[PDB]
Paper text:
Membrane transporters belonging to the ubiquitous divalent anion/Na+ symporter (DASS) family move Krebs cycle intermediates or sulphate across the cell membrane typically by utilizing the preexisting Na+ gradient. However, like other well-characterized bacterial DASS proteins, VcINDY is known to transport succinate and other C4-dicarboxylates, rather than citrate (C6-tricarboxylate)1319. Our structure reveals a homodimeric arrangement, with each VcINDY protomer comprising eleven membrane-spanning helices (TM1–TM11), two re-entrant helix-turn-helix hairpins (HPin and HPout) and two interfacial helices (H4c and H9c). Viewed in parallel to the membrane, the VcINDY dimer is shaped like an inverted bowl with its concave mouth facing the cytoplasm, allowing the aqueous solution to reach the midpoint of the membrane.
Author numbering:
A (entry chain A), B (entry chain B): 18 to 462
The structure:
């Protein structure tokens, strides 16, 4: 009777149709029919992102692509644990309140000026985003933004207080593109192509360094009258208590090891997924140093996302095993030989950046990273470039809400108009496709 | 500075000592030193049960026993997912309220008599326990017990209202021994020896059928004056709403397939971990039929327990790979040849039943099932008997609280004395060691 039940029923019909009607070697039919089925369920989200992910192995297994255990093992991938370390590391510094002190210390650095208030709000949202989440950093930033935007309270004076809202909304998404922990797409890319933490930062951080100014400049050069106003630093001041220095200590050490992982691991005998070990080490150091309880990490952890990771890897393998990867590569062979490498990555970049407006960031990467990376491998090229590209591009949701929760969070603020965001985003999207295709061209040789 | 930090530091010393001082082939030293380390951390619970479990792979990997991914794969074992199915199945019928209606319908079956009130409370606690949890079924039962025990309110008349409290506390633990989902020890045994859902019920259910009457009979034949009193059926009546029949429908179908798994799977082509697939199927049926959301399952799911599962399997493998299983089997060789098979299982059964008073049910099984099952295999015997034995025995916590949360739940009721429970439990423990050794002898040939 419901909308989504129909989407699902329609999808079941679509599969049954594709299955009985496509004219290929049986494996390819099955692979294509599945790829289509899942593609729908993740882009529509008729079933939860995670329920769909659990559906992948169960299909794989029932259609004899893999054996139950083999399909399930997909879920214990090392990256999934590296991401659990991220959740624990965040769990700690939220419950400890280290996210509050980093907000005040940097926010009070601005003596009482609105010019250097919001400009220090975007820098904090993005910095906090690098390690925490996008949705978490958005909902955590909202009261701190509405707090500041209460002196220039006149909401007939909207564009002073819309530049500041939509600013952090993007700063949370752009801050996600900094490191391997931060947003699921990045992790999906890492798991698909086997990136180290320090590998995804070599790509991502320079892009966030570039993108955040470019995003503010575009929001700025629309309707900003913010060079005026005063502050209201209203609430109890913060102070480093029982080892917020310790949480910072562990965090710092953890980040240090993640960066210097290459020479540390190499000069240790070369352990296998050193970054995942570091991440698990953090979960231990944080528990031995008593700084955060487990129930805290179990609440903070988005296990739904952790299951999505495995389900998407399961899919990636379903594509190889059924040969659907090679079949598509054969089909696209003429199209891609006629297209220049510029043309291809411009088309890829454009596609995602606009697709990601219609569906979840991760849900988009969950679908696209496998399809592309595997087809890339069928062409005998390194699946890294396309994957990292899609990873970044999926986190470029700037037009409407529903694109990302961070958009729908500053939107429920019953103030910003649908039309307004839709056109700053339309600009920033094109602006991004430039920067990405640009940087993607640069990181070639 | 804290107690547990010292326990941990002492343990680190113990390891360092055992490591540098034991006189064996290096692998055995490492294995023994590890086995001792983890043994402590799970029995003391100086670190959380789950943090310790995460510690197992990280050790294994660092001490070159396994490669990072190999050790981590331990966590994607099919049983872990079967148990996630259990969490989802419970999540549904709690949020749906099917646990409330099963309580009232069966509780109001008793017209208004205290004699058939508490006797229908134990039967419901145990029945509800089979599928939900122990701790969850205890905390859910407490208000419903205090509700009834308010007509015979005189707490100078204690033993009317202590028999009813300590009754459900045990009924929740004994109801856990019915099926594979229900209490983690049971799952640990299943994962160690590869039991099917229907396999653990063949053992377990007859034991719960036997044990629950035997437990009431012992609580009864102490200080019961409950053949007197009246009811107070006070609260809004229940009624089957938007497919509580559907949740019951899915649940029923799921349980049906779990029982008939052998012939259904065999007459389906023999899929690998059919019970796990059934469990995942339940997660899907429950979501497609819209009866429960995902965030609900993510709250209900004890991911901490799910991680514990894998960490304990990682341990089991650590023992084999380092040959510590074979080394202990060699050491116990003379002791066990001098001991009759009765003697052995009487010693095993006694050991756990009393050990489980001092530490968590699961924490006990997490340590003991691997050590025994593997040593059993070194002797070239089926690891099943010993494992299933330990699994049941670990859920026999009847003496003090701290033994199980269900004990500490009816204890905070600021009414039951330390001494009182300690002696009913001392009787029931011996009573159990009889029944177990008895049944364990019977299920031999
Ligand atoms: Na982020
Ligand atoms: Na998106
Ligand atoms: Na139970
Ligand atoms: Na116990």
């Amino acid at each position: 009777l419901h909308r989504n039940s129909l989407i699902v029923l329609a999808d079941v019909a679509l599969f049954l149709a594709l299955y009985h009607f496509l004219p290929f070697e049986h494996n390819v039919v099955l692979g294509i029919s599945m790829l289509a089925f899942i593609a729908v369920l993740w882009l529509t989200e008729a079933l939860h992102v995670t329920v769909t992910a659990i559906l992948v192995p169960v299909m794989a297994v029932f259609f004899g692509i893999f054996e139950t255990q083999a399909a399930l093992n997909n879920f214990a991938n090392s990256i999934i644990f590296l991401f659990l370390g991220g959740f624990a590391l965040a769990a700690a510094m939220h419950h400890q309140g280290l996210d509050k002190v980093i907000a005040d210390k940097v926010l009070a650095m601005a003596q009482g000026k609105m010019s250097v208030a919001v400009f220090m709000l975007f820098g904090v949202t993005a910095l906090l985003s690098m390690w925490i989440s996008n949705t978490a950093t958005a909902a955590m930033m909202l009261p701190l933004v509405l707090g500041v935007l209460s002196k220039v309270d006149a909401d007939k004076q909207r564009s002073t207080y819309v530049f500041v809202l939509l600013g952090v909304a993007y700063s949370a998404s752009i801050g996600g593109i900094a490191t391997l922990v931060g947003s699921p797409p990045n992790a999906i890319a890492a798991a698909e192509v086997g990136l180290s933490f320090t590998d995804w930062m070599k790509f991502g951080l320079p892009t966030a360094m570039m993108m955040l100014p470019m995003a503010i400049a575009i929001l700025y050069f629309l309707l900003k009258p913010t060079l005026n106003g005063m502050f209201e630093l209203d609430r109890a001041p913060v102070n480093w208590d029982k080892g917020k220095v310790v949480t910072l200590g562990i965090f710092g050490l953890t980040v240090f090891l993640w960066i210097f992982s290459s020479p540390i691991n190499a000069a240790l005998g070369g352990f296998k997924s050193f970054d995942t070990l570091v991440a698990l080490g953090a979960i231990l150091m944080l528990s031995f140093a008593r700084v955060v309880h487990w129930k805290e990490i179990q609440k903070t952890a988005d296990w739904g996302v952790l299951l999505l990771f495995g389900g998407g890897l399961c899919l990636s393998n379903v594509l190889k095993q059924t040969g659907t990867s090679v079949f598509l590569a054969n089909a696209l062979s003429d199209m891609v030989s006629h297209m220049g490498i510029f043309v291809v990555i411009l088309v890829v970049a454009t596609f995602v950046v606009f697709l990601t407006e219609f569906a979840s960031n991760t849900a988009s990467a969950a679908l696209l990273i496998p399809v592309f990376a595997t087809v890339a491998e069928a062409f005998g090229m390194s699946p890294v470039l396309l994957s990292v590209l899609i990873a970044v591009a999926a986190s470029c949701a700037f037009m409407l809400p529903v694109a990302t929760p961070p958009n729908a969070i500053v939107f429920a603020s019953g103030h910003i108009k649908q039309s307004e965001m839709m056109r700053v985003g339309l600009y920033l999207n094109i602006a991004c496709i430039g920067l990405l295709t640009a940087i993607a061209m640069l990181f070639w040789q």
